[PDB]
Amino acid sequence: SVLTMFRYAGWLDRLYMLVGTLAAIIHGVALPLMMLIFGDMTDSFASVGQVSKQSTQMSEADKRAMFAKLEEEMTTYAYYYTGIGAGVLIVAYIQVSFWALAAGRQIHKIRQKFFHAIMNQEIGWFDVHDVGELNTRLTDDVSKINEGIGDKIGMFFQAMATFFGGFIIGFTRGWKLTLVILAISPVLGLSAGIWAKILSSFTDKELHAYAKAGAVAEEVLAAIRTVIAFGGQKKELERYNNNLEEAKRLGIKKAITANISMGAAFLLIYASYALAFWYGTSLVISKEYSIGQVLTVFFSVCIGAFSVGQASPNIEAFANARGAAYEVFKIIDNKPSIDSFSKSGHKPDNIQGNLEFKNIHFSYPSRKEVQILKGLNLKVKSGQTVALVGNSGGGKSTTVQLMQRLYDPLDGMVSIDGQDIRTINVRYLREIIGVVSQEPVLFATTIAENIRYGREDVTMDEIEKAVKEANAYDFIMKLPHQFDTLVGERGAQLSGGQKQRIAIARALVRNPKILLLDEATSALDTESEAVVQAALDKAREGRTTIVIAHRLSTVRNADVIAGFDGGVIVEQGNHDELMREKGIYFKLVMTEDVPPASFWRILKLNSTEWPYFVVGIFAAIINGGLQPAFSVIFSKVVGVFTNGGPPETQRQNSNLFSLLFLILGIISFITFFLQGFTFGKAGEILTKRLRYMVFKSMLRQDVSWFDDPKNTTGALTTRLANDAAQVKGATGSRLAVIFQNIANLGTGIIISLIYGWQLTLLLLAIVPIIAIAGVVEMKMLSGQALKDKKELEGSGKIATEAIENFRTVVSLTREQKFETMYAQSLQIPYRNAMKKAHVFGITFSFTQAMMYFSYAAAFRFGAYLVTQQLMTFENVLLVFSAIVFGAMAVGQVSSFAPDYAKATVSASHIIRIIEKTPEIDSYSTQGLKPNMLEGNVQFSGVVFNYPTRPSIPVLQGLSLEVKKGQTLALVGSSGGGKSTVVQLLERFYDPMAGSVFLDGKEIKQLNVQWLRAQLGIVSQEPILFDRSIAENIAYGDNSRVVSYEEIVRAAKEANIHQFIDSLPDKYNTRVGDKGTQLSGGQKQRIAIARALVRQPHILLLDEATSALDTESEKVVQEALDKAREGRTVIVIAHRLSTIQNADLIVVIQNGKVKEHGTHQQLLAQKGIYFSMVSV
Ligand SMILES: CC(C)CCC[C@@H](C)[C@H]1CC[C@H]2[C@@H]3CC=C4C[C@@H](OC(=O)CCC(=O)O)CC[C@]4(C)[C@H]3CC[C@]12C
Ligand SMILES: CC(C)CCC[C@@H](C)[C@H]1CC[C@H]2[C@@H]3CC=C4C[C@@H](OC(=O)CCC(=O)O)CC[C@]4(C)[C@H]3CC[C@]12C
Ligand SMILES: CC(C)CCC[C@@H](C)[C@H]1CC[C@H]2[C@@H]3CC=C4C[C@@H](OC(=O)CCC(=O)O)CC[C@]4(C)[C@H]3CC[C@]12C
Ligand SMILES: CC(C)CCC[C@@H](C)[C@H]1CC[C@H]2[C@@H]3CC=C4C[C@@H](OC(=O)CCC(=O)O)CC[C@]4(C)[C@H]3CC[C@]12C
Ligand SMILES: CC(C)CCC[C@@H](C)[C@H]1CC[C@H]2[C@@H]3CC=C4C[C@@H](OC(=O)CCC(=O)O)CC[C@]4(C)[C@H]3CC[C@]12C
Ligand SMILES: CC(C)CCC[C@@H](C)[C@H]1CC[C@H]2[C@@H]3CC=C4C[C@@H](OC(=O)CCC(=O)O)CC[C@]4(C)[C@H]3CC[C@]12C
Ligand SMILES: CC(C)CCC[C@@H](C)[C@H]1CC[C@H]2[C@@H]3CC=C4C[C@@H](OC(=O)CCC(=O)O)CC[C@]4(C)[C@H]3CC[C@]12C
Ligand SMILES: CC(C)CCC[C@@H](C)[C@H]1CC[C@H]2[C@@H]3CC=C4C[C@@H](OC(=O)CCC(=O)O)CC[C@]4(C)[C@H]3CC[C@]12C
Ligand SMILES: Nc1ncnc2c1ncn2[C@@H]1O[C@H](COP(=O)(O)OP(=O)(O)OP(=O)(O)O)[C@@H](O)[C@H]1O
Ligand SMILES: Nc1ncnc2c1ncn2[C@@H]1O[C@H](COP(=O)(O)OP(=O)(O)OP(=O)(O)O)[C@@H](O)[C@H]1O
Ligand SMILES: [Mg+2]
Ligand SMILES: [Mg+2]
C-alpha cells in the first residue's frame, strides 16, 4: 500500500528507473568531485605557497616557478572539469529522460486501468457513490501522481548522492569530522518521513475537496438549462465556493507543513555542522588535526545544505503523489460481483426466449429499508408481448432493470429458458437484450454513430431499415448532413420525439431476442406512434418483448397484460380477461496567440496579496544571497583562524564560529519558512480566486455557448480542473525559489564585481548560453502544450459522457468501445509526454554540462589572470566559489521553464474566458423591471434559427397570443417547434427576426433575471439535482428561502406529498444524480412542484404529464384548474385530456400557425386537429 503506484511498471520501466538511478548517483558525485580538486588540491597549493613563503628571497625566479607550478595544475584541473562536464551531459540526459519515460508509460497505464475499473463497476456502486468526483480525479489525481513518480525521483537520487559524496570525500580527507554529520543524517531522514506522511495525509483531503468541487461543477454544467431557467447561478456558485474554501484551507495547511519542513531541515543541518565546527575546531587547536576547516572538508560538507534544499521539494512531490494514488487505486482494486468483463458463464447457442421471475424480493442499495418487489411472479412465453401496467413507483422499471441483471434480487430467481441468468455470461446476456429507457439518452456524436452503439458491425442498409422502422428516416433525410448530423449532449440538439425514435432504432439494430420497451412512445406524437407500433408488431414473432406503456392504446394489442399493485402482479391476462375482472386495468383504461504577458496578467489578480509577496521576496533575497556570502564570510573567518596568536586563545573564535553558524541556522529557518509560506498562501488564494472567476464566467454564458461541440460538460470540467492547476504549477514555492536563485546569481555577480571584475565577463557569458536553450525549450513545450490542452478536453469529454450515461453504456454493452475511444484520445498527449521527456532531458543535460564547462573556463582564465599579476589566487578562489553557486542558481532557474509555458497557456485561456461577455447577460442589472405584470404574452412574427444548425429554419413565422386566465395549448408533430417557443420566451436565444412581448413591452428591453423570475417552467425531460427532495422543490424560488410548509403545499399540489411522507428520511431523501433514484412519474411530479412553488405569473408546461399515470395527472389537472385564473399558462401536451379545457388551441406545423381556435371550433372543422384525435 506504499509502492502501490509503480504497480503497472514492467521490465522496460524497471530498467529505466535503475539506469536513471545509476546516472543520478553518477551525476550527483560530479559536484563533490568539483569541490575535491578545487578544495583539496588548489587551496592546499595556495596555502603551501603562503606558508612556505621566504618573502623577497630569490623572488625573481621563485615567483615565475610557483606561478608556472600552479598554472599547470589549474590547467589540468580545467581539463578534469571539461571531462567531468562531458560525462555530465550523458548522465544528466539519462537521469532525466529515463525517469520521465517511465513516469509517462506508468501514467498512461494508470489512466487506462482507472477508466477500465470505473467502467467495470456496478450500477449499485454508481448509485451509492458520486461520479463527478471520479471525473475530476481522473484528471487531477492522475496528474498529481505523474508529478511525483517522474524525473523528480531522479533529482532526489542526485542530491542524495551529492550529500553523501560530499560526506565520503570529507571522510577520506579527514577522520571523525564528518561522523557528527552522519549521526544527524538519520534525524533529518526521520523528519523527512514524518512531514512526508503529514503532507500525504493533507493531500488526500485536499483532493477530496477538489473532487467535491468538481462534482458540483459537473452537475451544474450538465443541468445549466434548469439552472438558468430558475436563476440558480448565484447558489450554484456559492456551493462551488464552499468546496473551494475547504480545498484552499487544506492547501494552506500543506504549505505550512512543507515550508516548516524545509526550514527545519536547514536549521537542523546548520546546527549539526555547527556542533561539528565547534568540536573540530577545539580538536584542531588541540592539534588532533591540522587542516579540517581550510576550504577542503568544511567546503565538502558545505554543499550538504544545497543538497537537502534541493531534495526536499522532490520528497514533497512524492508525498503528494502518494496522497493522490489512494482513491485511484482503491477504485482500481474494487471488484464487482456482477462482472461484465468476466468470461465465466454459459452462452446458450439457441435461446427460445422464455422469461420467468420467481418470488422476486428486491430493495435498492441506496434505500435498502424500502421494499420495491415483494414476491413478484411473472412468466413470459416465447415470442410473446407482455405489458406492465400500474401506478407510478410500482416497480415496473425495476423489473426491467433486474431483467438486464443490473442488480441481483435479494430473494428469488430470474431465469431464461429455465436457466438462472446468474449463471449466464453477463456480457452475452446483455448482448441478447435491446432496451429503450424511459427517457432515452444519446451521446455527443453523429446520428449514425449513436445508432452503431446498439450493434457495431451494423451496415448502412441496416441502419436505414432501422430508422424506417423507427419513423426517423424522413426527419433524418430532411436534415443537412443527414445521418452524419451531430447531436448534442444526451441528444439535447434534437426534439424529444426525434431523440426517442433514434433510441428506438438503436434498439432495433441489435436484432434483440429480448426487447425491453420502457415508455418508448412518451415523446412521440400519435401519428408517429401508430407507425412505430405497426413496425414493432410486424416482427413480434421473432422475439419476446416486455413493454411498459402509459399510452394504453399500445397495451390493448399486447398478448398478456400484467398489473402492478403493491409490488406484486395482481391481475395477469389478456385485454378481455382483465375486462372480466374489471379491476386495475379497467380502472386505468377508464378516463489565440498565447500572449507572453498572460502569466503576468494572471498575477495582477493577486494584487490584494502584495504584503505576502513583499515579505516572501525579501526572505528569498536573504536566503539566496546567504549562499554566495558563505564563501566571503568563510574567507574572513580564515583570517582570524590561521594565526590568532596563542593556540589556547583560539577558543574565543571557536565559540564565535558556533554562534555564527547557529544564528545563521535560525535565520535560515525563519527566512525559508517565510519564503515558502507567503508564496504558497498567495498561490492558494490565487487558485481559489481563479477557479471562482472561471466558474462564474462559465455560468454567465448563453445557452448557445453550451450548445457548442467544444463546450461539452466533460470539456468544461476538464478546463476547470486543468487551467487552475497549470497556473498553480508555476506559482507558490516554485516562484519563490525562482526569486531565491535569481538573488543568488545577483549576489554572486556583485561579489565578483567587487573582487575580480574579469570573471564577471565569464558570468555574463554563461548566462546567455543557458538562456537560449531555456527559451527554445520553452517555445517547443508551449507549442506542444497548446495541443496537449486541446486533446485533454476530448478525453475528459469521453470520460464524462461514459460516466454520466453509464446506465445506457452498460445496457448497450459499450464499455469496451468507450475504453477504446478513451485510449485513442490519450494517444497524442502520451506521445507529447514521451517527446517532452527527451526535450527536458537534453536541455537539463546541456545546462548542467555548460555549468562545468564554465567552471573549467573560470579556472583556465584565473590561471592567466594570476600569471599576468592581475588577480590574487585567494580572490580567484573566492570568485570561483561564487561562480559555482551562481551557475547552479542559473541552472535551477532554467529548470523552471517547462512549468512556465503551461502556466502561460492556461493563464491566457483563463483571461479569455473571464473577460468573455454574453449577449443575453443574466448578471446585468440593466433593463426594465415592470412594477405590474398582467401576464400577456405575444409572439409577433418570430423567425428563429438555432446557432448550431443555422441553415435550418425552425419557425418561419409565429404569431400567437395568450392573456391572464387563459390556457394556450401547443400541439403538432414532433420537431415542429413547440419546445422552441418555450426557450424563446425564456430568452435562451434571441429570434433572428420578429418580436416577443410581455404586457406590450419587448422582452429584450426587460431585465433577464426579472423576466425569468416571472415564468414557471417544467421541461420536457425534467432534471433534478443529487440533493434532497426539499432542496429540489425549493430550487424554484432562489431569491427567497422557501418554507417547509410552502414546500409541502407545492408537493401536495403536485400529488407527490404522500409518496414523500411514506418514504424513509421523508423530504430529506437524497435524490439520485439527475433524479435517477426516483420513478419517472415521481421525478416529473417533483419538477411540477418545483415549478408551482414559485406561484409564477406565467406557467410553461412542456409535456409536464408525460410520465404520470391517469389518477396522478387528473389530480394535477384539478390543482391547475383550481389555480387556473389569475395566471397565464402555456401547455404542450399530446393527450386529448389536457387540451379539452384549454381556452385556445394553436396547431403549429412547420414553425407556422396552421390551425387556431377553441376545442369545439377545431373539432368541428376538419383538418390536422381532427385527424390527430381519430382514435
Ligand atoms: C547501492 C549504491 C551504490 C546506491 C544506492 C541506491 C539507493 C539510493 C536506492 C536505489 C535503488 C533502491 C532500491 C530500489 C527498490 C527496492 C525494492 C523495495 O522492495 C520491493 O520492491 C518489494 C517490497 C514491496 O512490495 O514493497 C525495497 C527498497 C529497495 C531495495 C530500494 C532501496 C534503496 C535503493 C538501493
Ligand atoms: C551512467 C550509465 C547509466 C551509463 C551506462 C550506459 C547506457 C548508455 C546504456 C546501458 C544500458 C542501456 C539500456 C539497455 C536496454 C535498453 C532497452 C532498449 O529497448 C527497449 O526495450 C525499448 C523498447 C521501446 O522503445 O519500445 C531501449 C534502450 C535501453 C533502455 C538502453 C539504453 C542505453 C543504456 C542505459
Ligand atoms: C555516450 C553513449 C553511451 C550514448 C549515450 C546516450 C544514449 C544512451 C542515448 C542516445 C539515444 C537514446 C535513445 C533514443 C530513443 C529512444 C526511444 C525511447 O522511446 C520512445 O521514444 C517511447 C515511444 C513509446 O513508448 O511509444 C526510449 C529510449 C531510447 C531507446 C533512447 C535510449 C538512450 C539513448 C540510446
Ligand atoms: C544515493 C545514495 C548514496 C543514497 C540515496 C538514498 C538514501 C537516502 C536511502 C536511505 C533510506 C532509503 C529508503 C529506506 C526505505 C525505503 C522504503 C522501501 O519500501 C519498501 O519497499 C517496503 C517493502 C520492503 O521492505 O521490501 C522503499 C525504498 C526506501 C524508500 C529507501 C530508498 C533509498 C533511501 C531513501
Ligand atoms: C538523508 C536525508 C537528507 C534524506 C532521506 C530521506 C528519506 C529517509 C525519506 C524521504 C521521504 C521518505 C518516504 C516518504 C513516504 C513514505 C511512506 C511512509 O509510509 C507510512 O508509514 C504510511 C503508510 C500508511 O498510510 O500506512 C513511510 C515510508 C516512505 C516510503 C518514506 C521512506 C523514507 C523516505 C524516502
Ligand atoms: C523521496 C522520493 C523522491 C524518493 C522515493 C523513491 C522510492 C520510494 C521509490 C522510487 C522508485 C521505486 C521503485 C519503482 C518500481 C518498483 C516496482 C513495484 O513493484 C510492485 O509493486 C509490483 C506489484 C504488482 O506487480 O502487482 C514496486 C517496487 C519498486 C521496486 C519501487 C520501490 C520504491 C522506489 C525505489
Ligand atoms: C562560457 C563558456 C562555457 C563558453 C566560452 C568559453 C570561454 C569562456 C573560454 C573557452 C576557451 C578559453 C580560452 C582557451 C585557451 C586560452 C589560451 C590561454 O593561453 C595559452 O594557453 C597560451 C598563451 C597564448 O597563446 O595566448 C589563455 C586563455 C585562453 C584564451 C582561454 C580564455 C577563455 C576561453 C575563451
Ligand atoms: C560546444 C558547446 C558544448 C559549448 C562550448 C563549451 C565547451 C565545449 C568549452 C567551454 C570551456 C572550454 C574549455 C576552457 C579551457 C580549456 C583549456 C585549454 O587547454 C589547455 O589547457 C591547453 C594546455 C594544456 O594542454 O594543458 C583549451 C581547451 C579547454 C579545455 C576548453 C575546451 C572547450 C570548453 C570545455
Ligand atoms: N436507483 C434507485 N435507488 C433507489 N430507489 C429507486 C431507484 N430507482 C427507482 N427507485 C424507486 O423504485 C420504486 C419503483 O419505481 P420504478 O422506478 O420501478 O418505476 P415504475 O413503477 O415503472 O413507475 P413509472 O411509470 O413512473 O416509470 C420507486 O419507489 C422509486 O423511487
Ligand atoms: N439545441 C438545438 N440545436 C439545434 N437544433 C435543435 C435544438 N433543439 C432542437 N432542435 C431542432 O429544432 C427543431 C424543433 O424541435 P423542438 O424541440 O422545438 O420540437 P417540439 O415541437 O417541442 O417537439 P417534440 O415533441 O418532438 O419535442 C427540431 O428539428 C429539433 O431537432
Ligand atoms: Mg419507468
Ligand atoms: Mg418538445
* 3-state secondary structure at position 1108: coil
CA of 216 to the centre of ligand 11 (A): 27
Task: Please report, for the chain, the start and end positions of each structural domain, with discontinuous segments joined by +.
Answer: 11-336+597-915, 355-589, 937-1172
Q: What is the DSSP string of 816-862?
A: HHHHHHHHHHTHHHHHHHHHHHHHHHHHHHHHHHHHHHHHHHHHHHH
Spell 591-624 as b/e; 16+ CB within 10 A means b: eeebeeebbeebbebbeebeebbeebbbbbbbbb
Secondary element (H or E) of residue 1090: helix 1080-1092
CA of 854 to the centre of ligand 3 (A): 27
Angle ∠(1161,1166,1171) on CA atoms, nearest 5: 110
Alpha helices in 538-648 (DSSP H): 552-556, 575-581, 584-589, 598-603, 610-642
* Rounded distance between C-alpha atoms, residue 134 and residue 55, angstroms: 80
Secondary element (H or E) of residue 375: strand 373-380
Q: Determine the atom of ligand 1 nearest the C-alpha atom of 2.
A: 26
* Rounded distance between C-alpha atoms, residue 694 and residue 636, angstroms: 55
CA of 518 to the centre of ligand 12 (A): 19
Q: What is the DSSP string of 239-262?
A: HHHHHHHHHHHHHHHHHHHHHHHH
CA of 265 to the centre of ligand 5 (A): 15
Q: Is 811 in the pocket of ligand 9 (CB under 6 A)?
A: no
The alpha carbons of the chain give a radius of gyration, in whole angstroms, of: 38
Q: What is the DSSP string of 377-420?
A: EEEE-TT-EEEEEESTTSSHHHHHHHHTTSS--SEEEEEETTEE
Angle ∠(201,206,207) on CA atoms, nearest 5: 100
Test site for ligand 10: of 703, 980, 1100, 1154, most ligand atoms within 8 A of the Cβ: 980
Q: Determine the atom of ligand 2 nearest the C-alpha atom of 12.
A: 21
One-letter amino acid at 330 equals: K
Q: Determine the atom of ligand 1 nearest the C-alpha atom of 161.
A: 8
Q: Is 167 in the pocket of ligand 4 (CB under 6 A)?
A: no
Among 169, 170, 39, 183, smallest CA distance to 634 is for 39
Q: What is the CATH number of domain 937-1172?
A: 3.40.50.300
What is the DSSP pairing of strand 514-518 with strand 433-436?
parallel
Among 1081, 1015, 741, smallest CA distance to 893 is for 741
CA of 261 to the centre of ligand 5 (A): 14
Secondary element (H or E) of residue 428: helix 426-431
Alpha helices in 926-976 (DSSP H): none
CA of 986 to the centre of ligand 12 (A): 14
Q: What is the DSSP string of 596-623?
A: TTHHHHHHGGGGGGHHHHHHHHHHHHHH
Quick one: angle between helices 873-894 and 733-755, nearest 10?
160
Test site for ligand 5: of 197, 266, 308, 322, most ligand atoms within 8 A of the Cβ: 197
* Rounded distance between C-alpha atoms, residue 87 and residue 27, angstroms: 8
Please tell me the chain's helix, strand, coil percentages from 3-state DSSP, rounded to the nearest 5: 65, 10, 25
- Contact by Cβ (8 Å): 801, 918: no
DSSP state of 90: H
CA of 1048 to the centre of ligand 3 (A): 70
Spell 920-946 as b/e; 16+ CB within 10 A means b: bebeeeeeeebeebebbbebeebebbb
Backbone angles phi, psi at 388, to 5 degrees: -100, 120
Spell 138-176 as b/e; 16+ CB within 10 A means b: bbbbbbbbbbbbbbbbbbbbbbbbbbbbbbbbbbebbee
Among 981, 932, 937, 920, smallest CA distance to 1098 is for 937
Residues whose beta carbons lie less than 5 angstroms from ion ligand 12: 495-496, 979, 1020
Among 150, 569, 633, smallest CA distance to 375 is for 569
Test site for ligand 9: of 371, 388, 397, most ligand atoms within 8 A of the Cβ: 397
The ligand whose atoms approach the alpha carbon of 524 most closely is 10
Residue having the nearest C-alpha atom to atom 26 of ligand 8: 75
Residue having the nearest C-alpha atom to atom 11 of ligand 4: 189
* Rounded distance between C-alpha atoms, residue 271 and residue 663, angstroms: 9
Test site for ligand 4: of 1, 3, 152, 318, most ligand atoms within 8 A of the Cβ: 3
The ligand whose atoms approach the alpha carbon of 762 most closely is 7
What is the DSSP pairing of strand 560-564 with strand 569-573?
antiparallel
Q: Is 735 in the pocket of ligand 2 (CB under 6 A)?
A: no
Same CATH fold assignment for domains 355-589 and 937-1172: yes
Cα–Cα distance list, 748 to 81, 860, 864, 934, 1069 (Å): 20, 19, 21, 79, 67
Backbone angles phi, psi at 971, to 5 degrees: -135, 160
**Would you say domain 355-589 falls under CATH 3.40.640.10?**
no
Backbone angles phi, psi at 1089, to 5 degrees: -65, -40
Quick one: angle between helices 59-120 and 815-825, nearest 10?
160
CA of 973 to the centre of ligand 10 (A): 11
* Rounded distance between C-alpha atoms, residue 611 and residue 684, angstroms: 15
Secondary element (H or E) of residue 104: helix 59-120
> Greatest CA separation found in the chain?
137
Q: Can you give the resolution of this entry in Å?
A: 2.9
CA of 95 to the centre of ligand 1 (A): 17
- Contact by Cβ (8 Å): 92, 870: no
Among 1089, 730, 944, 844, smallest CA distance to 155 is for 844
CA of 8 to the centre of ligand 1 (A): 17
Secondary element (H or E) of residue 263: helix 233-285
Q: What is the DSSP string of 784-814?
A: HHHHHHHHHHHHHHHHHHHHHTHHHHHHTT-
One-letter amino acid at 313 equals: P
CA of 155 to the centre of ligand 2 (A): 19
- CATH homologous superfamily, domain 11-336+597-915: ABC transporter type 1, transmembrane domain (1.20.1560.10)
Q: Determine the atom of ligand 7 nearest the C-alpha atom of 769.
A: 1
Q: Determine the atom of ligand 4 nearest the C-alpha atom of 160.
A: 5
- Contact by Cβ (8 Å): 989, 944: yes
Q: Is 79 in the pocket of ligand 8 (CB under 6 A)?
A: yes
Cα 707 to chain center, whole Å?
Answer: 20
